[PDB]
Amino acid sequence: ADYDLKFGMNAGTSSNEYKAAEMFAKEVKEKSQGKIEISLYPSSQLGDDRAMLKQLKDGSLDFTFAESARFQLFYPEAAVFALPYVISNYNVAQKALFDTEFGKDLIKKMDKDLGVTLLSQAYNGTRQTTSNRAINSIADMKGLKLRVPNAATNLAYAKYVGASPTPMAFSEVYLALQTNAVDGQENPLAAVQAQKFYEVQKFLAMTNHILNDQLYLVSNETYKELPEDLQKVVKDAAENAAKYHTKLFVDGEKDLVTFFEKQGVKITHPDLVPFKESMKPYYAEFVKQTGQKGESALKQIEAINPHH
Ligand SMILES: O=C(CO)N[C@H]1[C@H]([C@H](O)[C@H](O)CO)O[C@](O)(C(=O)O)C[C@@H]1O
């Protein structure tokens, strides 16, 4: 095609992310009259999300996914998006990004500094904790060998609840669980399904600890080359895809209990009061490290009423 473009992702071919990206690619092909074709590169073929964000910056990859929280790699205060238990729900995640001074200035920085244009935001689920033994309370987290992604906020979740974290890439997790090299991991229900972690984890605990969004990102090097009518095709398609993406996750969160129980998984509901209390020193550390900018981001986000 005139524009043979590429969309990379960590998520695999059975995932909601991939299904929504498929929708995006199909609409862009159709509505561009075939001028743009977007091919998909799932399962970390191109590297992880850190690597793929660098590829958007350089222009060697056209589209990718990231969370708002991922930008804590560049702007430490943006860890606010993934401080456990701070963001109540997706409604808060949306307003935090688009309707705070903090969020709006982040979007502008992603463009100016990082060479990426934010097309749309979707919901990517609320992370829960799977394991090879029951988590009936916070006591069961003590010394649990808990895999985490290579992200500071997930590492801190594991540390402050009393677990023993092992960072590793998403692609490596299934084998780590299967072999019991680690005891557990944490991800939204949809990812537990998509990666088939239920095959290698007997237990799931509703820790409700971090809320993931999902940003549809384009490389400025690519977006600048598209005539403006095709830019609009791409933006409109990303917006349509994000709405579908969010629905896939919302529907799955009300539907997946039946699925996991049918697969033999035991689901627990530990008291979250001590999980939340265990985070108080982390929040203090975040404020110490990120200073006024972090205190401000937290104030702005904690001001958002969670009720639609
Ligand atoms: O790659 C992205 C893009 O948002 N998100 C990945 C996500 C992400 O890299 C982390 O939440 C850090 O922001 O990590 C996982 O949840 C995981 O490795 O458990 C996989 C998920 O696909």
- Residues touching ligand 1 (Cβ under 6 Å) are 10-11, 49, 65-67, 69-70, 149, 151, 170, 187, 191, 212, 214
In our burial notation (b when 16+ CB lie closer than 10 A, e otherwise), range 268-283 reads bebebeebeebbeebb
Q: Which two tokens stand for residue 183?
A: 């005891």
Cα of 122 vs centre of ligand 1, distance in Å, is: 14
- Residue with the two structure tokens 């400025």: 220
Q: With the C-alpha atoms ordered 85, 20, 246, 129, is the resulting torsion angle positive or negative?
A: negative
Spatial contact of 249 and 190, defined as CB atoms under 8 Å apart: yes
In the three-class reduction of DSSP (H, G, I as helix; E, B as strand; rest coil), residue 142 is classed as coil
- The gap from C-alpha 291 to its chain's centroid, in whole angstroms, comes to 25
Residue nearest to atom 4 of ligand 1 (CA): 66
In the three-class reduction of DSSP (H, G, I as helix; E, B as strand; rest coil), residue 13 is classed as coil
Spatial contact of 58 and 221, defined as CB atoms under 8 Å apart: yes
In the three-class reduction of DSSP (H, G, I as helix; E, B as strand; rest coil), residue 101 is classed as helix
- Residue with the two structure tokens 């808060």: 92
Classify residue 187 as exposed, middle or buried by CB count within 10 Å of its CB (0-12, 13-18, 19+).
buried
Contacts of 14 (CB under 8 A, 6+ apart): 193, 194, 196
Cα diameter, the chain: 58
Distance CA 58, CA 92 (A): 32
Report the run of H or E that residue 242 belongs to, with start and end.
Answer: helix 228-262
CATH architecture of 1-308: 3-Layer(aba) Sandwich (3.40)
Q: With the C-alpha atoms ordered 82, 14, 49, 20, is the resulting torsion angle positive or negative?
A: negative
- The gap from C-alpha 18 to its chain's centroid, in whole angstroms, comes to 13
Residue nearest to atom 16 of ligand 1 (CA): 187
Distance CA 238, CA 160 (A): 37
The CA-atom distances, in angstroms, between 211 and each of 23, 127, 232, 243 are 24, 6, 29, 17
Distance CA 249, CA 241 (A): 13
* Domains in the chain: boundaries: 1-308
At how many degrees (to 10) do helices 90-98 and 101-112 cross?
60
Distance CA 186, CA 192 (A): 9
Q: What are phi and psi of 56, to 5 degrees?
A: -60, -45
Spatial contact of 121 and 94, defined as CB atoms under 8 Å apart: yes
Q: By what method was this entry solved?
A: X-ray
**Pick from 196, 180, 195: nearest CA to 133:** 180
Distance CA 16, CA 191 (A): 9
Residues at the annotated binding site for N-acetyl-beta-neuraminate? 10, 49, 67, 127, 147, 187
Report the run of H or E that residue 118 belongs to, with start and end.
Answer: strand 116-131
